[PDB]
């Protein structure tokens, strides 16, 4: 966390910095999207 890394979440490849979020996700919701519909938040496996 808090460092520029290239991640992989169930095949979702990308590069960025990972931090905590206050996005009150619904139980069925897995990841969020921004205005441009690029992934903005994600729920990680093995930790929820």
């Amino acid at each position: 966390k808090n460092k520029c890394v290239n991640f992989n979440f169930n095949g979702l490849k990308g590069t960025g910095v990972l931090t905590e979020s206050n996005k009150k996700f619904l139980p069925f919701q897995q990841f969020g999207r921004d205005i441009a519909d690029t992934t903005d938040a994600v729920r990680d496996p093995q930790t929820l």
Binding site: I35, A36, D37, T38
Partner: protein
């Protein structure tokens, strides 16, 4: 001279009040700002 000075002062005060009470006076500058923001936001949305 005194009458002209009084008329000028009253006109200046009335212009101040009219600008303070009319919202559509600054429409040209507001439209410039809105056009720039709208173009940039549309360019952002186009990525999806």
């Amino acid at each position: 001279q005194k009458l002209i000075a009084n008329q000028f002062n009253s006109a200046i005060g009335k212009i101040q009040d009219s600008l303070s009470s009319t919202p559509s006076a600054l429409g040209k500058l507001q439209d410039v700002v809105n056009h720039n923001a709208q173009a940039l936001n549309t360019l952002v949305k186009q990525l999806s």
